[PDB]
Protein backbone atom coordinates (compact mmCIF):
# COMPACT_ATOMS: atom_id res chain seq x y z
CA UNK A 1 0.00 0.00 0.00
CA UNK A 2 1.02 3.71 -0.33
CA UNK A 3 3.51 5.20 2.24
CA UNK A 4 3.02 8.81 0.91
CA UNK A 5 -0.10 10.60 -0.40
CA UNK A 6 -0.43 12.19 -3.92
CA UNK A 7 1.58 15.27 -2.71
CA UNK A 8 4.47 13.24 -1.14
CA UNK A 9 3.35 13.77 2.49
CA UNK A 10 3.65 10.70 4.80
CA UNK A 11 0.20 9.04 5.24
CA UNK A 12 0.93 8.09 8.90
CA UNK A 13 1.82 11.65 10.19
CA UNK A 14 1.24 14.07 7.22
CA UNK A 15 4.90 15.26 7.47
CA UNK A 16 6.89 16.61 4.46
CA UNK A 17 10.33 14.88 4.87
CA UNK A 18 13.51 15.06 2.69
CA UNK A 19 14.76 11.69 1.33
CA UNK A 20 18.30 12.58 2.73
CA UNK A 21 16.73 11.41 6.13
CA UNK A 22 17.72 14.58 8.07
CA UNK A 23 14.21 15.20 9.51
CA UNK A 24 14.98 18.97 9.69
CA UNK A 25 16.28 19.24 6.07
CA UNK A 26 14.54 22.01 3.99
CA UNK A 27 14.95 19.79 0.84
CA UNK A 28 18.51 19.51 -0.45
CA UNK A 29 17.71 18.07 -3.95
CA UNK A 30 17.20 19.96 -7.22
CA UNK A 31 13.45 20.19 -8.12
CA UNK A 32 12.00 16.68 -8.60
CA UNK A 33 11.24 16.14 -12.32
CA UNK A 34 7.88 14.56 -11.41
CA UNK A 35 6.43 16.92 -8.69
CA UNK A 36 8.91 19.89 -8.36
CA UNK A 37 9.77 19.10 -4.67
CA UNK A 38 13.35 19.55 -3.40
CA UNK A 39 12.70 16.64 -0.93
CA UNK A 40 12.31 13.72 -3.45
CA UNK A 41 15.36 11.40 -3.93
CA UNK A 42 16.00 9.04 -6.90
CA UNK A 43 12.23 8.23 -7.07
CA UNK A 44 9.39 10.78 -6.52
CA UNK A 45 7.77 10.52 -3.01
CA UNK A 46 4.23 11.12 -4.44
CA UNK A 47 2.20 7.83 -4.04
CA UNK A 48 5.48 6.01 -3.36
CA UNK A 49 5.09 2.55 -1.66
CA UNK A 50 8.41 2.61 0.24
CA UNK A 51 10.73 4.94 2.20
CA UNK A 52 14.49 4.74 2.93
CA UNK A 53 15.23 2.75 6.12
CA UNK A 54 18.85 4.00 6.21
CA UNK A 55 21.60 5.79 4.26
CA UNK A 56 25.21 4.53 4.37
CA UNK A 57 27.95 7.16 3.84
CA UNK A 58 30.76 5.43 1.90
CA UNK A 59 33.73 5.33 4.37
CA UNK A 60 31.44 6.90 7.02
CA UNK A 61 28.34 6.76 9.29
CA UNK A 62 25.06 4.87 8.69
CA UNK A 63 22.08 7.34 9.02
CA UNK A 64 18.81 5.74 10.30
CA UNK A 65 15.27 6.90 9.43
CA UNK A 66 14.22 8.66 12.71
CA UNK A 67 10.46 8.02 11.94
CA UNK A 68 10.46 4.24 11.01
Amino acid sequence: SKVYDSQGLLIFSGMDLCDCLDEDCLGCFYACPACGSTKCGAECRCDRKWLYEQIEIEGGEIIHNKHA
Partner: protein, 87 residues
Protein backbone atom coordinates in the same frame (compact mmCIF):
# COMPACT_ATOMS: atom_id res chain seq x y z
CA UNK B 1 26.79 17.87 5.25
CA UNK B 2 23.74 19.94 6.40
CA UNK B 3 21.99 22.04 3.68
CA UNK B 4 21.00 25.74 3.96
CA UNK B 5 18.61 26.89 1.16
CA UNK B 6 20.75 28.68 -1.54
CA UNK B 7 21.47 29.04 -5.31
CA UNK B 8 24.84 27.34 -6.02
CA UNK B 9 27.87 29.41 -7.27
CA UNK B 10 31.70 29.12 -7.35
CA UNK B 11 31.78 29.77 -3.56
CA UNK B 12 30.12 26.33 -2.93
CA UNK B 13 33.38 24.65 -4.20
CA UNK B 14 45.15 11.17 -6.76
CA UNK B 15 45.88 7.48 -7.69
CA UNK B 16 42.06 6.87 -7.85
CA UNK B 17 39.90 9.28 -9.96
CA UNK B 18 36.74 7.80 -8.22
CA UNK B 19 38.08 9.22 -4.87
CA UNK B 20 38.69 12.77 -6.27
CA UNK B 21 35.15 14.15 -5.40
CA UNK B 22 35.53 12.60 -1.86
CA UNK B 23 38.86 14.51 -1.49
CA UNK B 24 36.91 17.68 -2.61
CA UNK B 25 34.43 17.06 0.35
CA UNK B 26 31.61 15.37 -1.65
CA UNK B 27 30.08 12.26 -0.02
CA UNK B 28 28.85 9.13 -1.83
CA UNK B 29 25.66 7.84 -0.19
CA UNK B 30 23.91 4.45 -0.48
CA UNK B 31 20.15 4.67 0.33
CA UNK B 32 18.42 1.38 1.35
CA UNK B 33 14.61 1.12 0.76
CA UNK B 34 12.27 -0.67 3.24
CA UNK B 35 10.73 -2.81 0.38
CA UNK B 36 10.59 -6.55 1.43
CA UNK B 37 13.16 -7.04 -1.40
CA UNK B 38 15.49 -4.02 -0.72
CA UNK B 39 16.70 -1.61 -3.53
CA UNK B 40 19.82 0.60 -3.19
CA UNK B 41 20.10 4.09 -4.77
CA UNK B 42 23.45 5.92 -4.91
CA UNK B 43 23.43 9.71 -4.53
CA UNK B 44 26.23 12.24 -3.99
CA UNK B 45 26.12 15.06 -1.44
CA UNK B 46 28.13 18.12 -2.50
CA UNK B 47 30.40 20.26 -0.24
CA UNK B 48 27.44 22.76 0.16
CA UNK B 49 24.98 19.96 1.09
CA UNK B 50 23.13 19.65 -2.27
CA UNK B 51 21.99 16.06 -3.01
CA UNK B 52 22.57 14.82 -6.63
CA UNK B 53 20.41 11.99 -8.10
CA UNK B 54 22.29 11.24 -11.34
CA UNK B 55 25.11 12.32 -13.74
CA UNK B 56 22.84 14.97 -15.42
CA UNK B 57 22.47 16.66 -11.98
CA UNK B 58 26.24 16.30 -11.34
CA UNK B 59 26.72 18.18 -14.67
CA UNK B 60 24.23 20.91 -13.58
CA UNK B 61 26.09 21.27 -10.21
CA UNK B 62 29.55 21.54 -11.84
CA UNK B 63 28.11 24.19 -14.28
CA UNK B 64 26.57 26.24 -11.40
CA UNK B 65 29.81 25.95 -9.28
CA UNK B 66 32.16 26.75 -12.32
CA UNK B 67 34.18 23.60 -11.59
CA UNK B 68 36.59 22.75 -14.48
CA UNK B 69 38.48 19.89 -12.68
CA UNK B 70 35.82 17.13 -12.14
CA UNK B 71 34.48 15.13 -15.12
CA UNK B 72 31.76 12.52 -15.82
CA UNK B 73 33.93 9.49 -14.86
CA UNK B 74 34.94 10.99 -11.46
CA UNK B 75 31.34 9.89 -10.45
CA UNK B 76 29.56 6.51 -10.34
CA UNK B 77 25.88 5.78 -9.57
CA UNK B 78 26.48 1.97 -9.55
CA UNK B 79 25.36 0.41 -6.20
CA UNK B 80 28.10 -2.36 -6.57
CA UNK B 81 31.05 0.00 -7.25
CA UNK B 82 33.10 0.66 -4.06
CA UNK B 83 35.28 3.76 -4.69
CA UNK B 84 38.13 2.29 -2.49
CA UNK B 85 38.05 -1.19 -4.18
CA UNK B 86 36.95 -0.93 -7.91
CA UNK B 87 40.03 0.98 -9.28
Amino acid sequence: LSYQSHDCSGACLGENPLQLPIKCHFQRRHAKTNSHSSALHVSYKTPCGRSLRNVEEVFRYLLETECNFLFTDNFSFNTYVQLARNY
